[PDB]
């Protein structure tokens, strides 16, 4: 139907359950209800968001499911298997992002060499 | 021999490319 | 009907002798069950006459005149530490079981190196353990004085790969001032017991022994080599064109 | 008669009920007891042909196992398109050097 | 959780990075569906459908069919980096040092061409 939106920002994963509009969302991780107001304050929940701060690959991987408030999670229609590394101050290496870095550096150095070129021709 | 190898490979690339540029500067200051 | 309880301790590779007294009745058959910890009683030997019988490396003997039966074991491995039960009845039914006897076969370890190592807590819970190991295989590890310090009994872990049978006991606590020097104070402690310094050792040449290689690293290293070849060729082109434009 | 080639943590141990006779291939280490032959790691590709007798069962038959691994780690994934790309850019770079020496030697 | 028709499980952690899927049904010919389409036709001796390594980040919808109806989906997701680069002082200093020496070599080259 409609996939979960896993927005990863830095070392913080925000899951978004796209279905069930208006109703209230509960989250199971490995058949263990999280997202409530426990002592764990690195995990916040919103109207439809799950904000996991300082994600840990070992602990917070595994299954996930959103289900409406007061319903059975075995009657939900959609499960997620999240396994994500995170990395503090770590910009990735896409196929096209690196090409944009290369072309920006090419344009900067081409501009600098044209400045030095016309400077030397003005000294010529 | 296997301590932190790529940094050694690339620094040796660095100070031999610098010496290559200095050799070309020697040709530019001797040949003409 | 009367089996001697209590754990008896036999060194590795020694003939073990157990016996059950039953005086007096007239029983037909005699049989020996072996029960490991947290399993069901498995049968070993089943005889019916007075005398001797041998199966595998075990030996069941029956003494109707002396009115006791006996079990003998040769080449006692450490993997036979178990509760031995003996069973007999009349010809019809109603087996009578003894209370069973704990047999502990502590190994011969042949190269002991006793030490107490602090282990590294894993950021989930507030405990911190001090594993104490190799023991000379004769160290009585008692329980603790407090109610916050726990002690497990000595167990024999059996590495099959390096072929090295070892002894262990683990002490964990939820309190401050629990250091490994003050952890196993209750039990008796042998000599040289290598309490480590808190400063690390950091053998680098032993970390190099564990280095695998994926296919991704192979292909990315070959891409680096290809880019170095292309840099050399295009820089040769550049220096030739600059020498051409400076020669004229 | 299957010779049990057990795979421990990252090693390979040939087990037998009697002593293992090496024939050819990786020699390995006879362990601290006999009847067990270590073959080094698995990623270093241990290969060979080993032979042992059989006691307690099998009536003193003698059997032979061939241990053959291909843990592919001196290997490289390559598309045919990527091989064509490497070859074509190499040819273009060599032609650039050819034109460089051509234009340099013509106008020294 | 094999009731409620969540028949697809993942057996991920492996010696290499190979992600595997498993379906629990009447095992004669398991038919594996990704995203709606068909990708797999599995008989014995095979049990586990592969997804390749986890460096390629296998994602998306997955489900299985046995002799009964289709299973509920499973959104397999991975951000298993194998490209992420930590911004140390050493890597930034190396990038800037290589950039400065490259632009100085090219600057001397341009200044001696158009001198």
């Amino acid at each position: 139907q409609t996939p979960y939106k896993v927005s990863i920002s830095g070392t913080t994963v925000i899951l978004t359950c796209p279905q069930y509009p208006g109703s209230e969302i509960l989250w199971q991780h490995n058949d263990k209800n999280i997202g409530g107001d426990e002592d764990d304050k690195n995990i916040g929940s919103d109207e439809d968001h799950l904000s996991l701060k300082e994600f840990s690959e070992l602990e917070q991987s595994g299954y996930y499911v959103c289900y409406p408030r007061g319903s059975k999670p075995e009657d939900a229609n959609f499960y997620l298997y999240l396994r994500a590394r995170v990395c503090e101050n770590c910009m990735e290496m896409d196929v096209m992002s690196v090409a944009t870095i290369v072309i920006v550096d090419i344009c900067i150095t081409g501009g600098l060499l044209l400045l030095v070129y016309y400077w030397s021709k003005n000294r010529k | 021999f296997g301590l932190l190898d790529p940094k050694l490979c690339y620094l040796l690339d660095g100070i031999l490319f610098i010496y290559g540029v200095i050799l070309t500067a020697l040709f530019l200051r001797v040949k003409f | 009907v009367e089996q001697d309880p209590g754990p008896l301790s036999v060194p590795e590779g020694a003939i073990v002798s157990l016996n059950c007294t039953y005086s007096n009745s007239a029983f037909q058959y005699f049989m020996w069950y072996r029960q490991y910890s947290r399993k069901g009683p498995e049968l070993l030997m089943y005889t019916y006459s007075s005398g001797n019988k041998e199966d595998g490396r075990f030996t069941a003997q029956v003494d109707k005149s002396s009115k006791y039966i006996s079990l003998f074991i040769r080449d006692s491995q450490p993997s036979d530490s178990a509760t031995y039960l003996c069973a007999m009845s009349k010809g019809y039914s109603t087996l009578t079981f003894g209370k069973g006897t704990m047999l502990l076969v502590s190994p011969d370890i042949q190269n002991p190196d006793p030490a107490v190592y602090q282990l590294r807590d894993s950021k989930s819970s507030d405990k911190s353990v001090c594993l104490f190991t190799d023991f000379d295989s004769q160290t009585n590890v008692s329980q603790s004085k407090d109610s916050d310090v726990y002690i497990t009994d000595k167990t024999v872990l059996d590495m099959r790969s390096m072929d090295f049978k070892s002894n262990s006991a683990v002490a964990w606590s939820n309190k401050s001032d629990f250091a490994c020097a003050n952890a196993f104070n209750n039990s008796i402690i042998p000599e040289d017991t290598f309490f480590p310094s808190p400063e690390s050792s950091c053998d680098v040449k032993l970390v190099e022994k564990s280095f695998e290689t994926d296919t991704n690293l192979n292909f990315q290293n070959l891409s680096v080599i290809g880019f170095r070849i292309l840099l050399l060729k295009v820089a040769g082109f550049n220096l030739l064109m600059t020498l051409r434009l400076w020669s004229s | 008669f299957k010779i049990p080639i057990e795979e421990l943590e990252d090693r390979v141990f040939v087990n037998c009920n009697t002593s293992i006779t090496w024939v050819e291939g990786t020699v390995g280490t006879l362990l601290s007891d006999i009847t067990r032959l270590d073959l080094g790691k698995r990623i270093l590709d241990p290969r060979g042909i080993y032979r042992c007798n059989g006691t307690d069962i099998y009536k003193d038959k003698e059997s032979t196992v061939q241990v053959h691994y291909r843990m592919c780690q001196s290997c490289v994934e390559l598309d045919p398109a990527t091989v064509a790309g490497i070859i074509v850019t190499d040819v273009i770079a060599t032609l650039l050097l050819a034109l460089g020496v051509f234009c340099f030697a013509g106008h020294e | 959780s094999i009731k409620g028709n969540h028949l697809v499980k993942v057996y991920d952690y492996q010696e290499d990075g190979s992600v595997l899927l498993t379906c629990d049904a009447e095992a004669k010919n398991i038919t594996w569906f990704k995203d709606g389409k068909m990708i797999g036709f599995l008989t014995e001796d095979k049990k586990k459908w592969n997804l390749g390594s986890n460096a390629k980040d296998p994602r998306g919808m997955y489900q299985c069919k046995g002799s009964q109806n289709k299973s509920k989906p499973l959104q397999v997701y991975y951000r298993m980096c194998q490209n992420c680069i930590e911004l140390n002082a050493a890597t930034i200093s190396g990038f800037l040092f290589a950039e400065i020496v490259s632009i100085f070599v090219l600057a001397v080259g341009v200044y001696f061409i158009a001198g």
Binding site: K32, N33, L58, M93, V98, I101, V102, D105, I106, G110, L113 | L4, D5, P6, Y10 | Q28, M31, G40, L85, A87, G91, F97, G100, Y117, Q118, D121, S122, S124, V129, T152, M159, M162, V170, F194, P196, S200, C202, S210, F211, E212, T213, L217, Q220, V224, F227, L230, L231, V234, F237, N238, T242, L245 | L8, E9 | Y11, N83, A98, E99, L106, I113
Partner: protein
């Protein structure tokens, strides 16, 4: 052989429980033994035929029923706090002609006076220290499952998704946190010793599964915390060589190499385009 179901079972005081035995070797008559620490095996009932049930040594509160000749289930109509034992099924062919028995794999029961006492095991995996890896060159992971009740765990080590049966010690009997009291809580430990050129990979993955057997879905729960059902609690750890040259620093070294050489290749190609344009303009302006 002889099978029986369930393996482990928890139930509140004053509650029936039917536990099944099954025997497909087609022996005739079965018996129920119970075992306590301190008293040995004690007979409960034995059924010599298809329907002919007879009492044993302690039949006090045990309804049996023999209808088929392969099943002889035991029933507990009302429960007691003195019911905590380990139960066993028996199997005999024909009336002392072949005196052998074949016991099943064991069935445990604990009976609490109130179901607020069940807890899940809190599991932690303690990584070794560098003192071992220098001194003995072998590493000992230690798992601690603390705080559960009743004693219904099955601890197991999984290395890269497959179990290990070589190098694992586990306590046969768990401790208690307060040994003087009655409704205490248990603590179980485990040791995985591993050659220390296997722990130093960052590729190997070690985890301590604990199969807790407890309540089910058909039982009421009016207490504030989560309902402690039959489940799996485990903790993981990657292997970690702290100081040295593993295969992650090398990953980032080769990634920075690819960045610098794509940048330098862009530099050199743009300088080639500049000098080729200068050569072409000079060859136009000479001809």
């Amino acid at each position: 052989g002889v099978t029986q179901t369930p393996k482990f079972q928890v139930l509140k005081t004053g509650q029936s429980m039917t536990l099944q035995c099954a025997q497909d070797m087609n022996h005739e008559y079965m018996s129920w033994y119970r075992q306590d620490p301190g008293m040995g095996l004690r007979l409960i009932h034995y059924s010599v035929g298809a329907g002919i049930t007879d009492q044993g040594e302690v039949p006090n509160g045990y309804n049996v029923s023999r209808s088929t000749t392969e099943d002889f289930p035991l029933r507990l109509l009302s429960a007691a706090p003195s019911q905590t034992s380990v139960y066993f099924c028996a199997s005999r062919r024909r009336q002392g002609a072949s005196g052998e028995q074949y016991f099943g794999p064991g069935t445990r029961l604990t009976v609490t006076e109130d179901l607020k006492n069940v807890f899940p095991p809190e599991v932690a995996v303690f990584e070794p220290s560098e003192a071992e890896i220098s001194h003995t060159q072998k590493a000992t992971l230690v798992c601690l499952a603390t705080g559960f009740y009743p004693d219904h765990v099955e601890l197991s080590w999984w290395v890269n998704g497959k179990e290990v049966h070589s190098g694992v010690s586990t306590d046969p009997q768990p401790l208690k946190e307060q040994p003087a009291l009655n409704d205490s809580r248990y603590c179980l430990s485990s040791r995985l010793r591993v050659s220390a050129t296997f722990w130093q990979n960052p590729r190997n993955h070690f985890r301590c599964q604990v199969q807790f057997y407890g309540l089910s879905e058909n039982d009421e729960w009016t207490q504030d915390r989560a309902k402690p059902v039959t489940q799996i609690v485990s903790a993981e750890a990657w292997g970690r060589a702290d100081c040295g040259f593993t295969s992650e620093s090398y990953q980032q070294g080769v990634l920075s190499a690819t960045i610098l050489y794509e940048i330098l290749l862009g530099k050199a190609t743009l300088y080639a385009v500049l000098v080729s344009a200068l050569v072409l303009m000079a060859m136009v302006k000479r001809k």
